[PDB]
């Protein structure tokens, strides 16, 4: 994936997260937990769903056409009738092959871009009160309790409240 998050700097996925495409796991004074990010997950799904709907709600009506199976041998005219159909068929098969190939590649990179977006979003919230350990984890340098962790997940966290405490722990 272009962003190197999924199957990248984030070693592996969680089979345990059954409530979303994205989330956090934390270990604090009070314990260890796991929520799933709705906003993030919903954004991946809405994009892949619109992406899907463009490809499957479409068919074209064709009634009387040319024949395609012959009971006897004829020659010139019949050859043309077959070439035509055979030609048409190969070109759509190519279109189909290419369609998914392209689509799938953009689909894998989009899920990667969404994971990364949540990470940068999170890092920007923490400011100077935390550091990116490189395994997809932020080491928050202050006591961040279940309430503090919730304020980060629902996006309410105030870096100013724990700033001093953190810098003390960071640059010591």
């Amino acid at each position: 994936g272009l962003f190197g998050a999924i199957a990248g700097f984030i070693e592996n996925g969680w089979e345990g997260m059954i409530d979303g495409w994205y989330g956090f796991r934390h270990q604090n004074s009070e314990g260890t937990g796991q929520a799933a990010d709705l906003k993030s997950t919903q954004a991946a799904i809405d994009q892949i769903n619109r992406k899907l709907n463009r490809v499957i709600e479409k068919t074209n009506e064709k009634f009387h056409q040319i024949e395609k199976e012959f009971s006897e041998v004829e020659g010139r005219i019949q050859d043309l009738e077959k070439y035509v159909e055979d030609t048409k068929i190969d070109l759509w098969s190519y279109n189909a092959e290419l369609l998914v190939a392209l689509e799938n590649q953009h689909t894998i990179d989009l899920a990667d871009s969404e994971m990364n977006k949540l990470f940068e979003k999170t890092r920007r919230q923490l400011r100077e009160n935390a550091e990116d350990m490189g395994n997809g984890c932020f080491k928050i340098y202050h006591k961040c309790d279940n309430a503090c962790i919730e304020s980060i997940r629902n996006g309410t966290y105030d870096h100013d409240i724990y700033r001093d405490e953190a810098l003390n722990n960071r640059f010591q």
Partner: protein
Amino acid sequence: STATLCLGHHAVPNGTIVKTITDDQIEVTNATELVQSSSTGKICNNPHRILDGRACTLIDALLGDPHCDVFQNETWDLFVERSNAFSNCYPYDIPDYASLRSLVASSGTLEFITEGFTWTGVTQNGGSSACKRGPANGFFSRLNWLTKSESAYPVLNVTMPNNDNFDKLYIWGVHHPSTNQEQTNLYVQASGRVTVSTRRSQQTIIPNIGSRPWVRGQPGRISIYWTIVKPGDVLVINSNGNLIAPRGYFKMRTGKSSIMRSDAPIDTCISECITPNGSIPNDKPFQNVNKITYGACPKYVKQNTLKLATGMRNVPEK
């Protein structure tokens, strides 16, 4: 003092394999099928007006082969010809069978209107043992076999105006006797001739005498021809022997009517798309059933399966 918050994405046990630009084989959490590859094995009796030829070919139905008289004046969005259909009438040939079967199929109607042609000087409604309409002899319902009357056969010359606002499809033909004795015996003249024309088309056929393999006992063959007379025009048939006269015409219409060769049972359901192998859903972009289709149908493709990824890459934990 510290706290540690890790970010992550999910994964699943049994993932799904999909193809990309940089991988022909890579696993994602979920995907959907794009290639309708299956059947019900049956053709739905609706939305399209379907007509089972049964034992009758659209042609024989048009000509009027005896066991095909139930099809008189029939209509169809989709005519269905069966593989065990047989012809049980007089040996016939149709130069350009495929095009007639075609235009008729597309008109999707067999509405025949009987016209008052007047054949003076000849014997009509002729028949054959190879046209047993019921136990007795007979002939194609829409054709009129003409023969000598009181030892003669006129230079026939009959006109029939197209005073309607639509196109008429006249289908006539000529008879090819097995021998000269037959020719002179039936039509007196030693050499026949059939000329059908409008102000726009003229076609003239000359009977050709010879012995041909017996079919339902007949060496002779009838060659069939057709003629479309446009509004404001007029039909003129001129012949001094061997003419198989028209009895009227077929109304010609334009639409989505067509024909298909199948053996697929016709059930009572609703499928927009129809194929020789039976109806099939049209919710998928592509299909691998049959290239022959009728209706709102997924494009046929060689690939029997194409998965569209609908989730991130799947990276399990061990």
